[PDB]
């Protein structure tokens, strides 16, 4: 249900209220970890704890569940990101008590999916528009939460 | 001098760390296997002994020479190989006893080398025509030993 990762578990199957603006520097630098996190987690290193430095609730137990299944049937994704622009980020008190943040982002990557049995990488691209929701933790770090693609 | 792509990738690395044809999907298969030796040699695990599986001569040391220095300042790349097109390749006679062939093919790749040290990658995105000259061993598979790109 969190943006994008049906894509993914598509391709590894048939191959192998106080409203504030943010930073629009720090906005872009919490994408970018995330998006090289989700590379090394995907990637041949496996990289799966690193996940839940930057994620927390859906967004990490969903793409927990697809590095692990990926580790296990030893296929691993190349990911380069082609393209990053932050569009807007805003922090707010829901309920107040913990402050969210709001990120809308758009974004161009591809990818290759190596199996070894199979000499030919299946292979994925993609430009989208994607709004992030983030929760400021008890530690004072964002971690992203939930994602959704647009239009 | 250079072979292939070597120089870009060491400026990034610098700045931001008689004759018959060939079954043209052998020769698809061939670059194939290379793209993704390459991968392998410059990603996170640094697999530069696979080098010489699938190179020689001088491809073999310059490439292996490039793996062992983004080894060193711990960088690596993250390569994806978008299209590729072999346009030609045949084989041709080398030398009293020796074999070789010519593969001419269309590339599009993109990379993204990883420097713990800055939160932006450098990223590199291209497309090009390539020659390869490729030499059969003593046992039967072919190695590449130059590569020239011609176009872009
Ligand atoms: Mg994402
Ligand atoms: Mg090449």
Redesign the pocket.
Known sequence: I????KVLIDMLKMHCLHKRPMDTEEAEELVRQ??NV?AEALGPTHQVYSLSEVLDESMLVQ?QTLAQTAEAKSCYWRFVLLHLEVLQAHIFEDGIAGEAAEIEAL?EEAAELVDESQPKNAKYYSTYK?R?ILKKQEDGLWK?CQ?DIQI
């Open positions: 969190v943006g994008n990762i995330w998006e989700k793409w974004l994607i992030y992203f994602s």
